[PDB]
Amino acid sequence: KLPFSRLVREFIVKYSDDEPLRVTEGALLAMQESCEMYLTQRLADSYMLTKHRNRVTLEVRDMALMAYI
Amino acid sequence: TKPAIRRLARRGGVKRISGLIYEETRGVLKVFLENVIRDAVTYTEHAKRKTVTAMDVVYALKRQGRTL
C-alpha cells in the first residue's frame, strides 16, 4: 500500500482543482489491480524480446523496445 | 520495493532481473498511473461527482492504448 497511496495522494492533490477527490476502497483496489497487470504485461512482452535475444536476464535493454513501440 | 518488482517479473515468467529495472519499472508505471489517476480524477470531478469509483478507474483504463 505504501508506494501506491503515495502516488495516488500525490496525483489526486496534483490534479485536483479546489479539493482532493474522496475515493472508495473498490476504486483504490480496482486501480491497484489494473496497474499491477500493466507492469506484468510490459515486462513480459519485453521478456519475449529477451528470449529472442538469446538471453535469460530481463534488462532495461528489453524494456526499451516495447516502450519505443 | 525490490521483491514487488521480483514478484511482478515472476508473474510474467521473468526469472532474474537487472538492477536498473527497479527504477525503470517505477517510471513506466507512473506514466500509466498518471493517465489513470489524471483521467479518473478529471472525469470524477467533472462528471457531477467528486469520488473515484471502480468504474472511473475502468474509464481511465479504456483511455490508455498502453493496454491495446
Numbering used by the authors:
A (entry chain A): 50 to 118
B (entry chain B): 31 to 98
Provide the publication's sentences verbatim:
To preserve centromere identity, CENP‐A must be escorted to centromeres by a CENP‐A‐specific chaperone for deposition.
The difference electron density map calculated using the molecular replacement solution revealed unambiguous density for most main chain atoms of CAL11–160. Most CENP‐A contacts are made by CAL1 helices α1 and α2 and loop L1, which interact with the CENP‐A helices α2, α1 and loop L1, respectively, involving a total interface area of about 940 Å2. CAL1 L1 crosses over CENP‐A L1 to facilitate CAL1 α2 interaction with CENP‐A α3. In addition, CAL1 α4 contacts both CENP‐A α2 and α3 involving an interface area of about 80 Å2. These CAL1–CENP‐A interactions appear to be further stabilised by CAL1 α5 and α6 which together with CAL1 α1 make an intramolecular helical bundle resembling a latch that restrains the position of α1 helix. Strikingly, unlike other histone chaperones, CAL1 shields CENP‐A α3 through downstream α helical elements. When compared to the available “histone variant”—chaperone complex crystal structures, the overall mode of CENP‐A/H4 recognition by CAL1 appears to be novel as it is the only one which wraps around CENP‐A/H4 through multiple CENP‐A and H4 contacts resulting in the shielding of CENP‐A/H4 surfaces involved in CENP‐A/H4 tetramerisation, DNA binding and H2A/H2B binding—all critical for nucleosome assembly.
